Amino acid sequence: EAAPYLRKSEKERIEAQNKPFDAKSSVFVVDAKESYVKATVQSREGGKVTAKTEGGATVTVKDDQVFSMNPPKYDKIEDMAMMTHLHEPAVLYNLKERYAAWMIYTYSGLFCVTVNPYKWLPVYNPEVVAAYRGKKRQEAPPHIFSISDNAYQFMLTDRENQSILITGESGAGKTVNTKRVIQYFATIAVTGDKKQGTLEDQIISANPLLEAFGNAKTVRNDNSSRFGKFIRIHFGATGKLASADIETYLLEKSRVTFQLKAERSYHIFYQIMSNKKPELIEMLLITTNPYDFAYVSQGEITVPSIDDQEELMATDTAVDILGFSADEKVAIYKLTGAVMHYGNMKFKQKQREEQAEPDGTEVADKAAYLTSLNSADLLKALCYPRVKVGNEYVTKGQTVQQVYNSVGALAKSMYEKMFLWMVTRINQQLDTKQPRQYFIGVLDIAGFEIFDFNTLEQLCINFTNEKLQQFFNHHMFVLEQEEYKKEGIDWEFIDFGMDLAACIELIEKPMGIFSILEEECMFPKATDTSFKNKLYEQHLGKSNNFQKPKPAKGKAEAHFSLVHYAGTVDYNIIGWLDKNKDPLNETVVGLYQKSGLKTLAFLFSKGSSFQTVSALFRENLNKLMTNLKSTHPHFVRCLIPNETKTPGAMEHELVLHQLRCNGVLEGIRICRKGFPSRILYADFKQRYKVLNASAIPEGQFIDSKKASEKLLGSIDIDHTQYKFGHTKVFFKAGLLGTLEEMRDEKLAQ
Description:
Blueprint: H1 11-18, E1 26-30, E2 36-45, E3 48-53, E4 58-61, H2 72-75, H3 88-100, E5 106-108, E6 111-115, H4 126-129, H5 144-158, E7 162-168, H6 172-192, H7 199-214, E8 215-218, E9 221-225, E10 228-235, E11 244-249, H8 254-257, H9 267-272, H10 278-283, H11 294-297, H12 308-321, H13 326-342, H14 362-371, H15 375-382, H16 400-430, E12 438-443, H17 456-486, H18 496-507, H19 513-520, H20 528-538, E13 560-564, E14 567-571, H21 586-592, H22 600-604, H23 613-629, E15 632-639, H24 652-661, H25 664-672, E16 679-680, H26 681-688, H27 704-715, E17 722-723, E18 728-731, H28 733-748
Binding site for ATP: 168-175
Protein name: Myosin-4
Region (Actin-binding): 621-643, 723-737
């Protein structure tokens, strides 16, 4: 009643599992509205099988889509984690059975997997939440509350840091549940001690502006955010709660470079550029028309019904809630205005001469005004730069492309900087002379999504995602080996982190794939086709998991085909190489440092210069990864099972692919090799004694081991189907299945 679904019955658990069943009947078949449906063998054939489906028709299917399924005992369990048959549909339908049971909290890895319920339930209500810490995993009903709970007691003794990691889910439920996560942080505060924005509400202070700030529109998602944020929480206290960080991580500058006409821009821009605030628009030296700024214009010209007048008002609401000055903050978004003005800047190339050279432009004068530079200062000092030290020397004649790239780079870097600045004061508003000794953290996205059409940066983020999965895998590898140790057993399995890292390694040698791309970009005035050819020599023979894409529909050309934890995904080339190109000039900020605005010092401040750009983006990740290596990570993966966020029912197929994207699926692929399985003596034998038909006294006249050796002596001798564990018993997925198959067959006879 309290937790009414969440532990649903003693009686019904039995009686459901009591219900009639047969595995050898109960089979997999492939569907137009599920990829797969539970099935019956009508008949079996060479490389096809003859089938009927519970709801639907009789159906004719090849062998490979099929096996008979883990029976009611399995059917009512808590755990994908304790699987006993591995094919995706099993997992999926079963959790769908949770969903029709509405049974919330789902487990694989050692960790819990999440769905926005789209409905009222008082999951929150403290009867569970306060009254107990709860339990380690096996011991209590599944809940995200667990993961926090045990991470605490773990750290409490351990006293080094941990973060909990929450995947995809890129809109409503993701953020709602992050909120509730900090709500449970408040519950931890209440647990620790008890006797100024509220701390969730303090994060809310950030949320609306920051949400506009780095949200983005996917073809398949409509407010989705392509910063990197990471959330930290910090303890000088193990009392009631101590205060928190949200932090600075991979940000996607290239989006400023480009959009397709279906697609839109960093939401800030789109929001501000609406019409409502009468003074700013001219104060901004701006036309309310997006249409003007081609570099802005590149996208889709609106989102029909996300109402940016009110969203403007919300931005005001937040910036005023900053308690930070109007004049700076106005100048600050005005910086962005300048940025879009830079899209207009366009240069021209003279006779008998290669230089790119000026359009003499009110745009530059707007810049001068806003900057408190003079435009001529730009014109001479940038547009033919100076760099030398030890003597000092001047740089002239840039190509059209050189200029265009250069200025875009500057603008982008400036946007970046502005984000970076936001840290300083926003956090300081958050920041406290209450100490921190120790840290617990939150992350939002291991972000991978698909389009029929693709662009490098996205793939790079996907690379980073799988890298995160490296981290997942090798930690599990270690821990599971500890579980081998736990009941006396010796490792027959090798690093998953390494194993899939090899798949990354195809991307990464001391040669990076990215590295060589951006590297060769310095080879000038040449065409991606050149690299195509270099692919075709370099990888296309060699690197097994990468492929020439097959013919397929939807697309003029696709160029790369390679294999991923999510499955296997194929992607395409426009000549964009230069987009990643980073120009630098000292001079630009160098003089801005002179300028009036006094944003500029924080505006302003060996590894590389004007180069290494995607590798820089590696570097940014890399540090993060390094620091995470210190930690214990914790894990949540999160789903819209539905067409929508609605009480309305499942939409399967994206849930399929999300789960492909959510490691549990091929993680369980990885683990099934483990015979990843531990089942306790007493229950097990309490079922199993039957065939031995043997009486020798309980207690240790027989161990469970002995009783096994006898029953096995009737039944099996194997390692792979089973091995002994010191307290609990270990199996091929199939094996429990056959065990109870025996049990029903024997008891019925």
